[PDB]
Amino acid sequence: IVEGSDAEIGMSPWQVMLFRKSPQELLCGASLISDRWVLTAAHCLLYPPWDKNFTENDLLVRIGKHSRTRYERNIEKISMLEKIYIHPRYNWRENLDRDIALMKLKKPVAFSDYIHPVCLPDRETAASLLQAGYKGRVTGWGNLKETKGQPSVLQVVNLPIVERPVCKDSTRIRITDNMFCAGYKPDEGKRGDACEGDSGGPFVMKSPFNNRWYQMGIVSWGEGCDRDGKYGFYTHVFRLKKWIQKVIDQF
């Protein structure tokens, strides 16, 4: 996360760290949506141009964490993957359209002060909150700068959703209805973006109607990090909710 701040303890209890086994490294962000299901970006698991194709057994999910590198004895929970489900029309060839994947854990994770699932939006949540100017929140252990570098603990930044024309005009990439972009404009003076290592992590919003946190987005792609005139792009969770429900109801 660039130009964000340290998270408070228990601020993001749905936060999930995708951790590589060997070599032991941060792979991506992700989120807890129930006691056995974790949501992330497909590109975190599958990206053939870079010969990325992680199997279940290649990694672990670490839940309840605050410090990036430390083993947080008695606080974090480490879980094994039972099965990875990537969106069957995830478009890694062209533009990362439908950048979303599910991970089923081998066993249920115990909820605690530090571990708790985020809500997924229904149609009216999306309609009500996914508005230009409305701010969401992005969290991760990703780099602090495009090129000081890595955080000691979980980072947080709030960012406004940006009008679709502005999003489109900021890039040569073909933008889809399964994407939104967020971030400040140069004219707004404030900064902040996700960055390398923040991928797959959640974009959340706190409904003012029922006071619950909803994950509207997944950190999916961007050009550089926190560049003037560029915006972070996010997988539009509600738009792919049908696929999400289909997966969990079937498996």
Partner: peptide, 27 residues
């Protein structure tokens, strides 16, 4: 169901240090 309600914040009626920024942008 319990989703989206944080044990150390909403469940105990404590706010985190910047959720107000979000609320203020919700029109």
């Amino acid at each position: 169901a319990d989703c989206g309600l944080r044990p150390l914040f909403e469940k105990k009626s404590l706010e985190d240090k910047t959720e107000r920024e979000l609320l203020e942008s919700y029109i």
